[PDB]
Coordinates of C-alpha atoms (C1' of nucleotides) and ligand atoms in Angstrom, one line a residue:
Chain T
X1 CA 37.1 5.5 -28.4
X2 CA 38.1 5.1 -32.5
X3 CA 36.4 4.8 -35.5
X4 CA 35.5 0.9 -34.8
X5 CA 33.4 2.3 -31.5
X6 CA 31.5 4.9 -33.3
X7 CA 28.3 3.3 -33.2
X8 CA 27.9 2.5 -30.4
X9 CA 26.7 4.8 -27.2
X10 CA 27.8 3.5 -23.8
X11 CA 26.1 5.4 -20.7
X12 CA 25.9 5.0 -16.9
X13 CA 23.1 5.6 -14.7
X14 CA 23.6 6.2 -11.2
X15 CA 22.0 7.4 -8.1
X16 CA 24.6 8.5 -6.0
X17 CA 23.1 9.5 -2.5
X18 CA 24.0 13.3 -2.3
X19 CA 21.9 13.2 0.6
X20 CA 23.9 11.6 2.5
X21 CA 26.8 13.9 3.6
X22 CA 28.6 11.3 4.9
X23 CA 32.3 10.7 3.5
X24 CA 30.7 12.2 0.3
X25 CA 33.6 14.1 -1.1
X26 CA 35.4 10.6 -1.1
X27 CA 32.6 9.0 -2.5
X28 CA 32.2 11.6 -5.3
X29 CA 36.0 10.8 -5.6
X30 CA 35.3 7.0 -6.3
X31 CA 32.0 7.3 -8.7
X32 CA 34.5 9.7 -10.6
X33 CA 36.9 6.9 -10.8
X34 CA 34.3 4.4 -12.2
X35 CA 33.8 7.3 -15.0
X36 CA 37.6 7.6 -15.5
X37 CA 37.9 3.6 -15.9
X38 CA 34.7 3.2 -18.6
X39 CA 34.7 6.9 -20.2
X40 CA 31.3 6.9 -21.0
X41 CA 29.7 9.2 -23.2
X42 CA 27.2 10.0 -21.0
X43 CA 26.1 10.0 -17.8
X44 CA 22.9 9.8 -16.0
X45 CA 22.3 11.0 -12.3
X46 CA 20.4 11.3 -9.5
X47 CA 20.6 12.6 -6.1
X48 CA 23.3 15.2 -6.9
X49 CA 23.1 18.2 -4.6
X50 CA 25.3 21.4 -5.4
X51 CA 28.5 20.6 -3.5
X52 CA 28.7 17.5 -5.5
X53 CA 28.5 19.4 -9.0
X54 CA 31.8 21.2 -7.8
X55 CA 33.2 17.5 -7.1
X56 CA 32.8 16.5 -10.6
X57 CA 33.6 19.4 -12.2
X58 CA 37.2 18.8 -10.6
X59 CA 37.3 15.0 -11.0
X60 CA 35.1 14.6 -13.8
X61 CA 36.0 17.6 -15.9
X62 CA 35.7 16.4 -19.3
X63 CA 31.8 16.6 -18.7
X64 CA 29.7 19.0 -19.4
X65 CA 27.1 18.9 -16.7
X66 CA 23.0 19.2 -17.2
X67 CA 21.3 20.0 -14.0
X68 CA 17.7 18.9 -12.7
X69 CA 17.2 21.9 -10.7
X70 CA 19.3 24.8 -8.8
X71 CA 18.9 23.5 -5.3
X72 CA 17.9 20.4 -2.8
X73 CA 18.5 17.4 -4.5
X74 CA 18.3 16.6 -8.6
X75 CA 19.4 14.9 -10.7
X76 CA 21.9 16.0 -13.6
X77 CA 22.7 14.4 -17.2
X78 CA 26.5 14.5 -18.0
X79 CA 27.9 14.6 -21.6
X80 CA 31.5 13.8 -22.4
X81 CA 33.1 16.9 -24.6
X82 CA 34.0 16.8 -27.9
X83 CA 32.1 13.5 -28.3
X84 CA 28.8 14.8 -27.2
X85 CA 27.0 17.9 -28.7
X86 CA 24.2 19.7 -26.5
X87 CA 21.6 20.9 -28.4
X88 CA 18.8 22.3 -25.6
X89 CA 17.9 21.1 -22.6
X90 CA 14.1 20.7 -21.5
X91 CA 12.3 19.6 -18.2
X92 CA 9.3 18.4 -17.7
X93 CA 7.2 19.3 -14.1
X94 CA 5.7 16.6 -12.0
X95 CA 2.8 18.6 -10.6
X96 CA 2.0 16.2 -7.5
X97 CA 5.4 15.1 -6.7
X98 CA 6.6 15.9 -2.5
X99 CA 10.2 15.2 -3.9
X100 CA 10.9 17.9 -6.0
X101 CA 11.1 15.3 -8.8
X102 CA 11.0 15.4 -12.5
X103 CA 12.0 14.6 -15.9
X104 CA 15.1 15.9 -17.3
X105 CA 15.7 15.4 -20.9
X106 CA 19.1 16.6 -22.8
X107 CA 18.6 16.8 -27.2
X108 CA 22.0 16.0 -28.3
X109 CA 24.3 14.5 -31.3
X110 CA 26.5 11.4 -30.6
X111 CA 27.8 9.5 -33.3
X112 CA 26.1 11.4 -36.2
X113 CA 22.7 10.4 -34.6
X114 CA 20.0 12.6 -32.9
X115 CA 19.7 11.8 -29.3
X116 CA 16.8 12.3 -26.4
X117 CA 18.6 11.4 -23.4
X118 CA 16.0 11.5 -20.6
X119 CA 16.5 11.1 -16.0
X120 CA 14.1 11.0 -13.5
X121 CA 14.2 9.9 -9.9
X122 CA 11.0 9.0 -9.5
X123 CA 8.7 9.2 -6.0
X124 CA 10.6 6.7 -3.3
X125 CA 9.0 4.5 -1.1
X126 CA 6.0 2.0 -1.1
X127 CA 3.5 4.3 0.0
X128 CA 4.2 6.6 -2.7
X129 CA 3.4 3.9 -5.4
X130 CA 0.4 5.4 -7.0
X131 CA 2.7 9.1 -7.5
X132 CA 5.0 7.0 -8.7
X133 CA 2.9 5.1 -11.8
X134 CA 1.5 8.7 -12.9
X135 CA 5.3 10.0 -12.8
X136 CA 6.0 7.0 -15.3
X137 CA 3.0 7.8 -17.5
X138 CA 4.6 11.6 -18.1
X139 CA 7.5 9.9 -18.4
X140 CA 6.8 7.2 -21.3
X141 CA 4.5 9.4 -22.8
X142 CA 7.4 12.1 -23.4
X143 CA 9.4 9.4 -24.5
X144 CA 6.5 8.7 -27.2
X145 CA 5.8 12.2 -27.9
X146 CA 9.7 12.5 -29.2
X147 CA 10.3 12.9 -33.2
X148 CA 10.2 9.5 -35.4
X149 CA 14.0 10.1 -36.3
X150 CA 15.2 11.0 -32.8
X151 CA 16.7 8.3 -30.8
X152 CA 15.0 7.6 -27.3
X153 CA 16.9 6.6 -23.9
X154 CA 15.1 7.3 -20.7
X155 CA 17.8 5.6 -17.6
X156 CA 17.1 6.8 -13.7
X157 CA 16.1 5.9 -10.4
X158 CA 12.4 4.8 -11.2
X159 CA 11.9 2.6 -7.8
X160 CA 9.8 0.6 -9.6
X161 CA 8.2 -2.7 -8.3
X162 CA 7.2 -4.9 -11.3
X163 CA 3.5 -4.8 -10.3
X164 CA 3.4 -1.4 -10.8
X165 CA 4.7 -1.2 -14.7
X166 CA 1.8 -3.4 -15.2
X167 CA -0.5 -1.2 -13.5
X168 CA 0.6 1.3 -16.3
X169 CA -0.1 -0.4 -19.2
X170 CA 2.8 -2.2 -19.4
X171 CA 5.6 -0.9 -21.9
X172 CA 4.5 1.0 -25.1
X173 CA 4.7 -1.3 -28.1
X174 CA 7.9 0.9 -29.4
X175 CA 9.8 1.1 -25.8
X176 CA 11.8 -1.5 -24.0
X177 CA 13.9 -2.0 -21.1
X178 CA 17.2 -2.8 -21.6
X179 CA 17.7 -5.3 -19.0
X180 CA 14.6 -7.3 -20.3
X181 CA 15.8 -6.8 -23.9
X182 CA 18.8 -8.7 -22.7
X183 CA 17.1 -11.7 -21.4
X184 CA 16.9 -10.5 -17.7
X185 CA 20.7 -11.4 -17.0
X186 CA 21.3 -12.2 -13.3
X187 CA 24.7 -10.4 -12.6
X188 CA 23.2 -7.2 -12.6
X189 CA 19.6 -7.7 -11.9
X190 CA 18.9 -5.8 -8.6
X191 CA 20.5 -2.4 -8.5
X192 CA 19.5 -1.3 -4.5
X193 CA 20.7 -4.7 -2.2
X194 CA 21.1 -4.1 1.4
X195 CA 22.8 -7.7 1.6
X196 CA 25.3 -6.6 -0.8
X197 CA 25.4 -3.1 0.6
X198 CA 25.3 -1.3 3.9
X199 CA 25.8 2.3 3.5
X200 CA 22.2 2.5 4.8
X201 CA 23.3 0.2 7.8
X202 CA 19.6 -1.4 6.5
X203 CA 19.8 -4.9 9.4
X204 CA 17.7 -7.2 6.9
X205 CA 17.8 -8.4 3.3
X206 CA 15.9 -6.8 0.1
X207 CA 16.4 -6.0 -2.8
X208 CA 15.3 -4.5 -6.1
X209 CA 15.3 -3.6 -9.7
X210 CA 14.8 0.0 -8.9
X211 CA 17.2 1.4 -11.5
X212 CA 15.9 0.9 -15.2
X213 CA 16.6 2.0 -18.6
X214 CA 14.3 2.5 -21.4
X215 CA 14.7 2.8 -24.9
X216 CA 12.2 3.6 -27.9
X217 CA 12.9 2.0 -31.4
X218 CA 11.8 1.3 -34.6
X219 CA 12.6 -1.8 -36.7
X220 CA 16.0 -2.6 -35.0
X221 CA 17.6 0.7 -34.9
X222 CA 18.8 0.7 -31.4
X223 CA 20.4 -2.6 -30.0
X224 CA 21.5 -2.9 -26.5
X225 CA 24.8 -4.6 -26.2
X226 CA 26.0 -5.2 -22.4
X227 CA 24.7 -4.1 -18.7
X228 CA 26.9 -4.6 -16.3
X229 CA 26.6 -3.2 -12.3
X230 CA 29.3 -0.7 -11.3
X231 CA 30.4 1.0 -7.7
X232 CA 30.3 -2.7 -6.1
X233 CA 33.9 -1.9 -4.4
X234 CA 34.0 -0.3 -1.0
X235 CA 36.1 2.8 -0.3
X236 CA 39.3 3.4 2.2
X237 CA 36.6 4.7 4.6
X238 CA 34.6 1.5 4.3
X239 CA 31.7 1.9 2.7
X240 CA 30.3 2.2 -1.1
X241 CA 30.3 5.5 -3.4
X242 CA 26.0 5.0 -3.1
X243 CA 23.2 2.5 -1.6
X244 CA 22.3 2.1 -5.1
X245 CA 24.4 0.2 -7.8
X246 CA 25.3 2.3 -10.8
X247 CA 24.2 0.8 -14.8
X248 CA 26.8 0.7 -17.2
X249 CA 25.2 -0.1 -20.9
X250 CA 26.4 0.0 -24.4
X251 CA 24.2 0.2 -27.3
X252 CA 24.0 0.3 -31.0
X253 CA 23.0 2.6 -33.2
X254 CA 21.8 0.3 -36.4
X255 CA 21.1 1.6 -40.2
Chain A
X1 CA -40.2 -10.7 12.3
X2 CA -36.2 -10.9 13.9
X3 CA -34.2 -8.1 15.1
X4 CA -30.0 -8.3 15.9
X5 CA -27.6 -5.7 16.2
X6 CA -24.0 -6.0 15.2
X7 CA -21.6 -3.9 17.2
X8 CA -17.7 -3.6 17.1
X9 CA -17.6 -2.7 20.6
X10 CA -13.7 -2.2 20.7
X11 CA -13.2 -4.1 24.3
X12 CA -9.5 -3.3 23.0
X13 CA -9.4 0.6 24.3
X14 CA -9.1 0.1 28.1
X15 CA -9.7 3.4 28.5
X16 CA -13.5 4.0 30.4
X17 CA -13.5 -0.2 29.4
X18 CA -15.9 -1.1 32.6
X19 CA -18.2 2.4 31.7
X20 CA -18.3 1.5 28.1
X21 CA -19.2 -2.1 28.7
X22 CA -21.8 -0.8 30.7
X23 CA -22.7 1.7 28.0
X24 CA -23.4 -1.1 25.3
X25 CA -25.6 -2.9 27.6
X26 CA -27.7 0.0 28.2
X27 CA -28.3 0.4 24.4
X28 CA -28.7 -3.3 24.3
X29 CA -31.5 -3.1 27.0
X30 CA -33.6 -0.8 25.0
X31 CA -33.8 -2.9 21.7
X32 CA -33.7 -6.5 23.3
X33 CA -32.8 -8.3 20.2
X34 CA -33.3 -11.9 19.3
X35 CA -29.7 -12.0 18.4
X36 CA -26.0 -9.7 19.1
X37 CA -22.7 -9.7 17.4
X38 CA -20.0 -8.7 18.9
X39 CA -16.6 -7.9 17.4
X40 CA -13.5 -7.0 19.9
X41 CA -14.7 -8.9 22.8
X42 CA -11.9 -9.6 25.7
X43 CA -12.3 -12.4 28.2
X44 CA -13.3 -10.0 31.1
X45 CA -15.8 -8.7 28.6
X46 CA -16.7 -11.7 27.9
X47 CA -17.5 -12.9 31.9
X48 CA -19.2 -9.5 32.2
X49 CA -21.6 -10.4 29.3
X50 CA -22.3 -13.9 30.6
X51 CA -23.4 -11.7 33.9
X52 CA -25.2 -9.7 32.4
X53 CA -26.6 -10.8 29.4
X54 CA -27.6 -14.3 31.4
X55 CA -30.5 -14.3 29.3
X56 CA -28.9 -14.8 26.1
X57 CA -26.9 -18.0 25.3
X58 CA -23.4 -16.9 24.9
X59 CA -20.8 -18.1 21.9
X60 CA -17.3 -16.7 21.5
X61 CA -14.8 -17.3 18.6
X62 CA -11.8 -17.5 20.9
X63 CA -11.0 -18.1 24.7
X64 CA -8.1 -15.4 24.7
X65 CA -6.8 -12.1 23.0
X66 CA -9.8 -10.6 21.6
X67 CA -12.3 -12.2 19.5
X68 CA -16.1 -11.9 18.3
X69 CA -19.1 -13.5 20.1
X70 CA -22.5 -14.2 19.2
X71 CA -25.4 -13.9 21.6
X72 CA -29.2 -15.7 21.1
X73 CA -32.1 -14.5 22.7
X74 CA -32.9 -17.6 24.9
X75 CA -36.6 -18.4 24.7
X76 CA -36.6 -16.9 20.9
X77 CA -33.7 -18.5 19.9
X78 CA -32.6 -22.4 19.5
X79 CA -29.3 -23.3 19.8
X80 CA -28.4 -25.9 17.9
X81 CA -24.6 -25.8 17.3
X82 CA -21.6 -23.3 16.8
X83 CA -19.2 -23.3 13.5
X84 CA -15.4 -21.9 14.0
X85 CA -13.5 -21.8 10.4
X86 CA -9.8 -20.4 10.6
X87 CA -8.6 -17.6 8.3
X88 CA -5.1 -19.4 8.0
X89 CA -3.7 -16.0 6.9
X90 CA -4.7 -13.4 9.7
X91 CA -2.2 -11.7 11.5
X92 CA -4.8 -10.7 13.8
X93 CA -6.2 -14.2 15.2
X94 CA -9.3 -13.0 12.9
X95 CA -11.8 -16.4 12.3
X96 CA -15.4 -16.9 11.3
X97 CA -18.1 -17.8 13.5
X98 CA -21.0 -19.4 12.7
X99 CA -24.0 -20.5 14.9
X100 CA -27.3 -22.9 13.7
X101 CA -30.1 -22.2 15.1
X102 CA -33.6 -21.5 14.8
X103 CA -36.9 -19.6 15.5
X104 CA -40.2 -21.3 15.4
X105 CA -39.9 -23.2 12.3
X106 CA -37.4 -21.6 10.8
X107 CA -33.9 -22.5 10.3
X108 CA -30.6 -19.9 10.4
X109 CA -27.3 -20.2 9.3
X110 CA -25.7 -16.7 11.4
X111 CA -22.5 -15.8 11.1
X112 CA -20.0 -12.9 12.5
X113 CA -16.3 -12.3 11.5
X114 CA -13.9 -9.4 12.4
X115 CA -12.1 -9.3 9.0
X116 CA -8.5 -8.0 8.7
X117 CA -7.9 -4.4 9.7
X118 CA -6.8 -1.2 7.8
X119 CA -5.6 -0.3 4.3
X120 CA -2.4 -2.1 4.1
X121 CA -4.1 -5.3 4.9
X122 CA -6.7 -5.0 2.0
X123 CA -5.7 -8.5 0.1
X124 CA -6.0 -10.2 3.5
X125 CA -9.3 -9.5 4.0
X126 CA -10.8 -9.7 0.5
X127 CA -9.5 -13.8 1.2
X128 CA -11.3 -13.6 4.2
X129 CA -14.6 -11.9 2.7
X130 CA -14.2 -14.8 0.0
X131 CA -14.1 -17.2 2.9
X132 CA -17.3 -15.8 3.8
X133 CA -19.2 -15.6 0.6
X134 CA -18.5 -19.2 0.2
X135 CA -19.5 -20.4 3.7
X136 CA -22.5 -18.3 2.9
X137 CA -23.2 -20.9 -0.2
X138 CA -23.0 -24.1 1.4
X139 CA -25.9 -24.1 4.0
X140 CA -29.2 -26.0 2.5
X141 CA -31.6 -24.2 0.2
X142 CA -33.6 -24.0 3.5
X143 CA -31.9 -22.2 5.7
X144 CA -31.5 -18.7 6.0
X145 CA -28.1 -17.6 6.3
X146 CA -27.2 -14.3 7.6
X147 CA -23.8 -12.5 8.0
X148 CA -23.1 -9.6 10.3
X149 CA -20.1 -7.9 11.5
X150 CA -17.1 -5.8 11.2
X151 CA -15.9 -6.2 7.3
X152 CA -13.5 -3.2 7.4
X153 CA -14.6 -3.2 3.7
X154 CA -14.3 -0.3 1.2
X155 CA -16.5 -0.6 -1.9
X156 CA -13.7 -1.1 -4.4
X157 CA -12.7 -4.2 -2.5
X158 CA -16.4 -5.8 -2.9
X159 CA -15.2 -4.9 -6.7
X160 CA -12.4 -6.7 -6.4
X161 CA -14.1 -10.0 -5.1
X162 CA -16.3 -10.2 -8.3
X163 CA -19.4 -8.5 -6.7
X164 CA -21.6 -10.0 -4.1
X165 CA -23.0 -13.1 -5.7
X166 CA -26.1 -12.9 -7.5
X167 CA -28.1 -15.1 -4.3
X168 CA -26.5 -12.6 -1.6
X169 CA -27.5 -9.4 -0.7
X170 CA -26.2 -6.2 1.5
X171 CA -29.2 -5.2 3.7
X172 CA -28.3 -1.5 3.3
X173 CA -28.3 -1.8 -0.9
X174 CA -31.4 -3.6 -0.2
X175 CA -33.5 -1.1 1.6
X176 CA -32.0 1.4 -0.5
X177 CA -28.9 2.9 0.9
X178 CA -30.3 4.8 3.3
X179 CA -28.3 7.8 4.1
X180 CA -29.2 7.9 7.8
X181 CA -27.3 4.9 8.8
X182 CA -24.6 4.4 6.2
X183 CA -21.5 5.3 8.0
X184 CA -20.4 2.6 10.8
X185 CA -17.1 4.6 11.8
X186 CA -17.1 8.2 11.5
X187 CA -14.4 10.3 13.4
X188 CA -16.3 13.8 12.7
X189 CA -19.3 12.2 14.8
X190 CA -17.4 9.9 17.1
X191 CA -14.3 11.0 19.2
X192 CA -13.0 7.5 20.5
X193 CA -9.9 7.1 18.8
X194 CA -9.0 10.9 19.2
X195 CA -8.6 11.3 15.3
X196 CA -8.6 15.1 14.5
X197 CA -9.8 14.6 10.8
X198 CA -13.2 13.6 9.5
X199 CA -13.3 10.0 7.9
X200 CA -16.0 7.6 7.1
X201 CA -16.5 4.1 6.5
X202 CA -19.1 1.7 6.0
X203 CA -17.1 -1.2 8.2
X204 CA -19.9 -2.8 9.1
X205 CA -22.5 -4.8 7.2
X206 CA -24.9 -7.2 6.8
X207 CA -25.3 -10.1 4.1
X208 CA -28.0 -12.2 3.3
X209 CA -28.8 -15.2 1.7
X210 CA -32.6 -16.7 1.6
X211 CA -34.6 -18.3 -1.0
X212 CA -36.4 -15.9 -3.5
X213 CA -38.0 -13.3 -1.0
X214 CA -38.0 -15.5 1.8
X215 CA -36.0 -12.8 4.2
X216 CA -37.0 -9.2 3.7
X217 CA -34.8 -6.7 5.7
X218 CA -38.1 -3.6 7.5
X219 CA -35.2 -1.7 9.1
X220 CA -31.4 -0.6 9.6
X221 CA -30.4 1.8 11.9
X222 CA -27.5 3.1 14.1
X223 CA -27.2 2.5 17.6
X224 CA -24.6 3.8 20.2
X225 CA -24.9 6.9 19.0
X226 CA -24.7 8.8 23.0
X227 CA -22.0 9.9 24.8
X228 CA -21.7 7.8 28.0
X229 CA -20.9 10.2 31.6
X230 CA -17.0 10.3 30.4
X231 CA -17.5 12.1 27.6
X232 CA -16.8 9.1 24.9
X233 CA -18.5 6.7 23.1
X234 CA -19.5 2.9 24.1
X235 CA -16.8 2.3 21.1
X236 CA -15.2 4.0 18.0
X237 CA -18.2 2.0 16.2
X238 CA -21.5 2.7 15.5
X239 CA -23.5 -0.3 16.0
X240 CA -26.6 -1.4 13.8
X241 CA -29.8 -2.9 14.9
X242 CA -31.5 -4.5 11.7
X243 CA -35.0 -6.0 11.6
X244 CA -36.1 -8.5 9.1
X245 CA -39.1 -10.5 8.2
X246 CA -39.6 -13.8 7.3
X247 CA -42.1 -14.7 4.3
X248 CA -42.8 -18.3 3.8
Chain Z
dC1 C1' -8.4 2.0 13.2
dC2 C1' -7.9 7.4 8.9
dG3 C1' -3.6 8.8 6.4
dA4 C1' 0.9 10.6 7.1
dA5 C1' 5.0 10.6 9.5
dT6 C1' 8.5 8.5 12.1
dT7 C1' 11.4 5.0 14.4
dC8 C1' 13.8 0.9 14.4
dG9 C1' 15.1 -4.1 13.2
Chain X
dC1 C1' 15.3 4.1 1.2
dC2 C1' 13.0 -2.2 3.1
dG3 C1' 9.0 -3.0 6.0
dA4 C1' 6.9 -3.8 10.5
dA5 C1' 5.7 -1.3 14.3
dT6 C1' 4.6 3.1 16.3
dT7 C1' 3.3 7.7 16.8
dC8 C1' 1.3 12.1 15.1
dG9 C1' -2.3 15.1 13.3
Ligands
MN1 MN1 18.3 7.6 -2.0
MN2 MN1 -11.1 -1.6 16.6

DNA sequence: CCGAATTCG
DNA sequence: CCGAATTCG
């Protein structure tokens, strides 16, 4: 990264299935490798559990690491030193949630801009819909609450159905999803595929749009400029770092 | 002045099955209504109802699996021919049946259905109470048309349908809601199904369509409320025994 | 035939 | 962490 990249932020966001403990020193191993190849300037987790904070503090060391919680499962927001400075961290409670989930959100600088970097992982399953809208309520309404000159990106595990961000009350005016922003591109569409992916040895065929990013902006001031899916390779032991697909986006931080 | 009852009489549990056949026809006995509904009828339910209930004329909605019947009065009632319309959705053989008949001078349209079951199948059956509400619309001005059975309705689904139409009416909102028989299937009061939580439902209802006051519900009430020599119920289901009026 | 939990394709 | 089927409370 040089002076011509410098206004740009590039992220990935990534659940990466600390709960299962299988092969998951190797699969730490290979989500570190995807962050070796791109060097984002941040990253964005979920499902870390404590073991795997000691993974990537050995093979991701050039992260500062901003947890979700001290123990379970949580999810963690990663910032690359000497690019990225923390300013505070702050997390926000889901009262109702059975998961333990909530909202993380990091206040940073990154390319002489202010940043709100905000995960969640938000309730799993079907039957856990209605949880699931009121965690993304908290969640966009954080995202509103956030100073005019502060820059806004919310990226997690939302497992969203499209139904349900209509049940909401759709986007806010000022917040939009990357991935729509971007005119719904195919390649990298559905983020959770047991087709494509078998690590939860799943015998049948869905797949979903479960991993999402959302930006607030004023007037053009943030413009996303690729998605692409990452952690589509298996591993020597055969299988993938995750069940889920990771996000890798740039965007642009416009005058 | 016509009296049914509409009973889910769950011919589905085999458990104390023969008992609580028996059981039903007791209650049955002591009302002797013009007309029955039955939801959850099995063909040996079925033959022991043409044994025993001889003196009714006997229509089912299917020959296998389980399926709803209706049952006129013979003497009060004139049959004069029986309706089947599919619900091409169901995933539970689920139909409606609809009978013509009529009393004296007076002409019904009577229908029964079973609609989808449970929570998860909630868009199912709102198609299915839709199917209904329009079947309800197309008999002549004339004829009284009355629906009965086993809706597995909550409120919020009705809602959801737009409202009953402005020409259709639920006899329990008509005689006011009375609090003595709104609950159909209640686990704190009925054991059946073993369910160790209290839950209540108003599955079972009653529609009506009749020119401007021409059918005026005088009573609703539960019935199957006793616990048979085993200990249970004749079925996880209140029944309801309804008696109307008609005002020419 | 409730609502939650679990198993299994 | 799908969804249909099943069991549990
Ligand atoms: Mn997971
Ligand atoms: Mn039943």
């Amino acid at each position: 990264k040089g002076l011509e990249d410098s206004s740009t932020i590039s992220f990935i966001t990534w659940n990466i299935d600390g709960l299962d403990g299988c092969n998951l020193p190797e699969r730490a191993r290979g989500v570190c490798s995807c962050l070796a190849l791109y060097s984002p300037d941040v990253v964005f987790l979920q499902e870390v559990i404590p073991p795997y904070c000691a993974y990537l503090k050995k093979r991701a060391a050039s992260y500062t690491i901003i947890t979700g919680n001290e123990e379970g499962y949580f999810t963690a927001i990663l910032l690359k030193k000497g690019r990225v400075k923390f300013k505070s961290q702050e997390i926000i409670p889901f009262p109702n949630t059975k998961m333990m989930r909530n909202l993380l959100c990091v206040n940073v600088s990154l390319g002489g801009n202010e940043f709100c970097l905000m995960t969640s992982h938000l309730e799993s399953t079907r039957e856990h819909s209605a949880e699931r809208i009121r965690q993304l309520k908290t969640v966009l309404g954080k995202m509103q609450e956030a100073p005019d000159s502060t820059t806004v990106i919310f990226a997690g595990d939302t497992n969203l159905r499209d139904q349900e961000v209509i049940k909401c009350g759709g986007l806010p005016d000022n917040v939009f999803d990357a991935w729509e922003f971007l005119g719904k591109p195919k390649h990298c569409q559905y983020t959770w595929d047991t087709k494509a992916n078998n690590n939860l040895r799943i015998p049948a065929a869905y797949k979903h749009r479960f991993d999402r990013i959302f930006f607030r902006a004023e007037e053009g001031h943030l413009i996303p400029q690729s998605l692409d899916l990452v952690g589509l390779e298996k591993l020597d032991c055969g299988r993938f770092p995750s069940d889920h697909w990771g996000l890798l986006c740039t965007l642009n931080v416009v005058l």
